[PDB]
């Protein structure tokens, strides 16, 4: 005789969903995404001083 029960007073918090754009650190980035990066060889970024 093995009885299976379930509480009605207390519920869990399984997942803690942390988004990076919720953080204060997301200033220091420029978060632009490719949906194609693995197809790319050496990409370059220019500066004129």
Q: Which residues bind other proteins (CB under 8 A)?
A: 2, 4-6, 8, 11, 14
Report the C-alpha gap between 35 and 49 in whole angstroms. Answer: 31
Measured CA to CA in angstroms, residue 16 lies from 7, 13, 19, 25 at distances of: 22, 7, 10, 18
Main-chain phi, psi angles of 29, to 5 degrees = -100, 170
> Closest CB to other proteins among 4 and 39?
4
> Closest CB to other proteins among 8 and 21?
8
Q: How far is the CB of 8 from other proteins (least distance, A)?
A: 5
Q: How far is the CB of 18 from other proteins (least distance, A)?
A: 16
């Amino acid at each position: 005789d093995v009885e299976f029960d379930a509480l009605l007073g207390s519920y869990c918090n399984t997942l803690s969903l942390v988004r990076f754009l919720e953080l204060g650190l997301s200033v220091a980035c420029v978060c632009t995404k490719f949906p194609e990066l693995a197809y790319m060889n050496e990409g370059r970024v220019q500066f004129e001083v």
